[model samples]
Target: TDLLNVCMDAKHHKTKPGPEDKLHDQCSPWKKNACCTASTSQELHKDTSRLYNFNWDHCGKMEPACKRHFIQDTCLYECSPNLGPWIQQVNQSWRKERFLDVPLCKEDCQRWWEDCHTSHTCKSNWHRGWDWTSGVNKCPAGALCRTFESYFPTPAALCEGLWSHSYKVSNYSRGSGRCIQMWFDSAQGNPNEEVARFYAAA
Candidate 1:
């Protein structure tokens, strides 16, 4: 028998059945609440684009910080063995979309603003009406705000058992962090079925 149950509580970065298990609050509309979709999963092919041609272990041997920097730094010097070629390729290929001149104000707001609407008034560090809020609109073109406070998504099949999902970093200021919510593909029964029929209508 196929028995489906929807829990009232979704997941978040710091809370959940662990944040990765709660699908109702995934960050982007393009993302399936708990279900894995072909469109979104296609993004996995991006790794083939040579973002990491050299193994980190080999590069990090000369500098431990390289390991850490590789995960966060955007510059070429951040890597060892002169990843000039690879970095150049990456910069040229995705630079237009990934790297933008985030002005000082935008950078500051990107680091402190809570939501898109509220972020507009974050001039000169004015906190008069600044409050932390969240919404899908605040997320980037390919992403969505997954929480009122943070963004995280569980990236695997839900309703079966616990699975390790990928973590995405949020670009929001005060709420910036990793998104690790759960993927629910479907409910507590038949693993081969679609779960969209069960979402709560807003």
Candidate 2:
């Protein structure tokens, strides 16, 4: 009986990839950052795993304790507590929109291209919204300080990259990533446009 079982196991092991099997004979060309790449799903999975321990309540509600830590910690705490994965999901979605959802692509790539661009044109014009000064200051009526609300929680030093540059140019490195910073103005009376018009016409 044992000999018969061994023979059966060997026969089973001999089974080959079938017509129904979608296994690829050759590795996908998009190996570096492609979806079909062996490492692609695993890398994305790692990012998902890092999504663990996020704290939504602490983040959205702005808890003081979580406030001491950067928003990253707060998000992690919410993931751990499982308070609301929805919030994390939403935040993650926002992150994807801000980072991965580029406006255009040269080919199948996510980066922008004149012909194959997948994302929107870079909002370089948004630069007109803010007044960049030498030191710390409040955002103008139509602009935002980026990390002004939660001071301790923000990597302010990281924001220096935003401050150091002239507001007009596009940031290729930090532009689309989490490190990207610029003014966001949604004031009721179109203050941003007025400010920009004044500056340009001045």
Candidate 3:
């Protein structure tokens, strides 16, 4: 019976890539930094495994860009692992808005934390609208901080379990994913004005 089981397991293995190997394949392409590339396969496996399991704590062990976004314990504690799809969605929106090159700075980070806490206290009564005219005037010559709120239209119940109320709407069933969106605005001069719709959200 033991030999038969071993033979069956070997047949199932079939020399195909294991979970770690497949994860490695997915992770290897993202190794644009020397820090990421220098990581051993075991380290990659561990990081990828945590990501796959929806654990953001492992993000600190990854690349700098990942660190900037995931921010180790902060992301793990506040944002849900299921937020991956929403993050991608926000990234796409930013890409369409041509805000991809915006550089994140300490001021932006501080503002984000402040806004996060304020939104929590204000709850649903926070009706601060959009600011299209001002733009990011106070930002340095090249950079401006733009803040806005986004509503996903999905059911709020889907995100109710998340700890950070900043990421989801207060009323479940009535609304869905509500989030504070902040972007550092930067652009080249003499560009097409029509193409660059520079608007600030507060």
Candidate 4:
């Protein structure tokens, strides 16, 4: 009966279980084999290692203070090596959309003047009622404000070198998006900077 049970278990499932299946199982939520779609897996694994092309070996490499400048510096030096003045090019195009000429209400008319003119002055009080006009105020010359309206997608592209190695050693087949999803889902709980450092160093 034990042998029969084993045979039945093996033959009952149309698809033979493999590492990919195991990965799918691991990644599935509620153990129902759902969630972690193919597209999600691809995004989680795509170009992950490219983030390490530069020297992330240094300490504090992915810290907020470090990552901000490191990303731009790496893009400048590695993304297009030997290109003329890459840093300058990046600076010229970087965050251009964020800075905008914004209009703000300025103190064109003093509050005291507005209050005094409106309150005390009248047609009966003086020869002519005091009149105060509000004038347009302009922003400082050549000044721009940083607008937070724009949305910036995750900086995955900028740090692809670091992410590429995050799953390189796993035996999960690329075709099985579920496995990749499982690995990424498990990894998501870790500190992002720590993860980046680990893969970049590897």
Question: What is candidate 4's lDDT per residue for 44-106, written digit by digit as tens?
Answer: 222222222122211121233333233322221221111111111112222211111111011
Best by the TM-score measure: 1
lDDT of 1 by residue, 1-202 (tens): 1122221111111111111222212212212222222322232222222332323221113233222222222111111111111111122332321211111112322222232221111111111122223311121233332221222112111101110111123233321211111211223332212211221110
Off by over 4 Å in 1: 1-51, 57-62, 74-96, 103-202
Rank all candidate structures by their TM-score, best first, as comma-separated numbers. Answer: 1, 3, 2, 4
lDDT of 3 by residue, 1-202 (tens): 1111010111111121212222133233222211122223223344323322323231122234433333322222221111222221123321211111211223333433433321212122121222213431112232222221222112231122122232333221111112222221112211111111221111
Error of 1 at 47 (Å): 13
**lDDT tens digits by residue: candidate 2, 54-110:** 222211243333222223222111111111111111133223111111111112111
TM-score of 3: 0.16
RMSD of each predicted structure:
20.2, 23.3, 20.6, 27.3
Q: Where does model 4 exceed 4 Å of error?
A: 1-48, 51-62, 79-82, 85-202
Instruction: Compute the lDDT of residue 186 as modeled in candidate 1.
Output: 29
Query: What's the ranking of the predictions by lDDT, best on top?
Result: 3, 2, 4, 1
Q: How accurate is candidate 1 locally (lDDT)?
A: 0.20
The Cα RMSD of model 1 versus the native structure comes to: 20.2
What's model 1's lDDT at 119? 15
Model 3 segments beyond 4 Å from truth? 1-70, 73-81, 84-139, 142-166, 169-202
